[PDB]
């Protein structure tokens with residue numbers, strides 16, 4: 133497999149302006165007829181090079197003349213000796229039923245559906261499968277009427293007819309030129325939820341949600357979320373939907389989350405289907421986020437698309453930023469920010485420290501499907517958010533407006549977007565652009581001094597980004613570094629110098645810099661990197677008392693949570709070192725006291741309290757350490773939970789009881805109380821065994837919603853309570869027919885602290901609700917074990933690695949995209965001790981030797997073994 137390079141970008145030799153597709157659909161053999169209007173832009177002797185994968189070519193015509201001047205080669209059809217403008221007609225066959233990779237045209241249950249991003253359309257026909265080629269599509273679909281009564285593609289229905297032998301057809305036209313990755317086709321039999329949204333300017337939009345027969349009871353929340361998304365994009369960004377119909381199809385078999393195909397989004401059913409007895413608060417909020425995300429792509433991705441795939445973050449960073457802003461505006465901004473920061477520090481930082489490290493705009497890609505990453509998406513959003521911090525909302529929106537004005541109807545670059553922001557705002561972003569080209573996580577070190585003689589406070593701030601495997605050279609970035617200074621009363625000290633106010637967002641642009649503030653009338657307690665103002669590691673020598681002071685006094689809820697994280701980090705590190713020496717947990721009394729105060733504080737938002745009372749995950753804890761000890765981390769997390777459960781037992785029960793809610797509502801105040809109550813339950817499960825078992829079993833059985841039922845079941849598994857097996861069996865018996873609900877149970881099985889977890893996981897490969905044919909099942913059982921049970925995955929006997937090798941040997945052939953998701957825990961080997969590294973290296977070497985090794989795995993394995 134050959135690497136492709138961003139610096140090799142060249143405008144295409146040919147454009148296609150219009151394509152008319154016909155599908156004669158059948159699961160075994162689909163015939164595709166594609167009639168494209170092409171125009172040569174390059175040299176008169178340049179051949180037309182069409183991408184194609186696994187196609188059976190039937191015929192090639194140019195202006196209806198059977199063409200003799202062509203050859204097929206690896207991944208391509210190369211057509212020579214063409215006029216400047218011509219009609220290309222290709223007929224080819226494909227086999228949806230044979231498509232286990234779920235890219236191109238494939239089967240999802242009884243339905244046929246497509247996935248074309250990034251380079252899936254070339255699995256359907258020979259085409260210019262590159263996103264800077266935009267064409268107007270029309271799509272004719274011919275199929276068996278009984279099997280496929282609904283035949284959907286992008287845009288509007290313009291023709292329909294009936295044929296002999298029980299077949300029918302529909303033709304669709306989408307007026308907006310698009311790259312082929314935004315093409316979609318769906319055929320099948322569905323229940324349809326229909327509704328309407330009227331845009332602010334009065335365009336009435338038909339909304340249609342297609343779900344498997346029998347699932348209409350689970351569709352209204354997604355529909356509500358769609359309307360919410362449409363309204364928000366109007367209010368916040370001034371953007372209206374631009375077509376007459378908005379279709380969403382929920383499919384059970386899907387490699388990712390959802391796909392923004394113009395006017396015909398295709399969603400993993402996990403991000404559509406919800407009922408109060410099947411879905412948790414988190415599921416509801418995820419459906420909201422993902423519905424919003426795909427909707428927001430209509431402008432940031434569709435109306436303006438990507439010139440090439442190295443520009444992926446142009447749409448993904450900006451659309452993730454938009455979905456976060458949406459969720460934050462509608463819900464708790466603090467809880468959203470907190471959770472997004474947990475993801476950055478606990479998951480994205482790990483990727484940036486790994487062999488797969490890349491800038492948000494990559495320079496080199498072998499398999500583009502490998503680059504739909506925490507970096508491109510989540511760090512991409514942090515970079516957008518930094519622009520927002522630097523510009524402020526008004527200038528940011530001016531930048532958005534200039535971006536659309538310039539680039540609407542075209543494929544653009546990351547640099548185009550940055551230039552629009554810079555030009556609209558008059559803020560210089562030339563240095564800022566390095567965030568697009570540099571990989572790795574900057575470390576920002578802060579030292580301070582208070583001078584009582586002069587009433588000056590001095591911050592000396594330094595930065596460095598360690599070298600990464602992809603980049604030997606690193607340079608200083610433009611880091612927006614937000615601060616707040618507090619006096620002894622918890623009041624904010626005005627920032628000023630030489631008689632002028634100073635902006636609280638410091639521009640940290642050098643390797644080292646000093647900032648001096650005057651009229652600092654009392655020695656301050658600083659709040660540093662407020663609202664996680666840049667995606668960086670902060671090094672500052674906090675005292676415990678400074679941190680508990682911030683937990684009490686900090687103005688923004690994020691700062692209060694973040695101070696608690698810094699307080700915990702010190703004692704997590706302490707207790708992991710202790711674990712390694714065979715010593716039990718040690719925690720100062722004043723630390724337990726800070727958490728008691730949070731529990732008992734009547735004024736604190738329960739949403740905030742709940743997050744402070746949610747310990748960092750084992751993945752967040754891992755990032756505190758150069759070399760990860762996953763067993764020590766897991767056991768310390770449990771010991772810390774048990775210690776707090778004992779110290780806080782009375783308070784935890786009081787708050788648990790106080791937050792009881794008889795009515796279940798998917799409403800932010802109720803969700804916040806429930807999140808707090810269940811945070812309390814988690815500790816209570818790890819307290820005195822009989823009371824724990826009673827509380828947990830009672831909640832599981834009395835729950836009137838899945839959030840409370842699953843919180844109880846999860847606690848029973850985590851604390852290995854007596855009731856565990858009975859409750860787990862009860863859930864299986866009730867829910868085994870429901871794959872999405874069973875995913876929750878597979879996750880609990882996979883992440884269990886039980887000594888025999890791997891045995892159980894292997895046995896579950898035979899479970900009635902599990903199948904290797906479904907990405908959701910695979911991720912919930914196998915992915916959760918390897919990625920979310922590092923203590924078991926990294927068992928000292930190497931059994932976890934051997935298990936994953938077995939699974940990846942299957943998935944490499946079946947579904948390389950899912951295989952490549954699942955190999956990630958193995959490529960982290962350099963973070964582990966020598967003995968583990970050698971077993972992980974052996975595992976990777978076994979996979980490297982596989983017959984028919986996918987490009988997806990090849991790329992990751994070679995980087996890991998380098």
Ligand SMILES: N[C@@H](Cc1c[nH]c2ccccc12)C(=O)O
Pocket residue numbers: 247249250387388389390391392425426429448501504
């Ligand atoms: N474009 C989708 C992501 C996606 C869905 N399916 C895919 C398959 C391959 C690559 C990306 C995807 C999004 O970010 O909203």
Ligand code: NA
Pocket residue numbers: 459460461462463464465
């Ligand atoms: Na809000």
Ligand code: NA
Pocket residue numbers: 579580581582
């Ligand atoms: Na100091």
Ligand SMILES: [Zn+2]
Pocket residue numbers: 425429447448451452
């Ligand atoms: Zn996206």
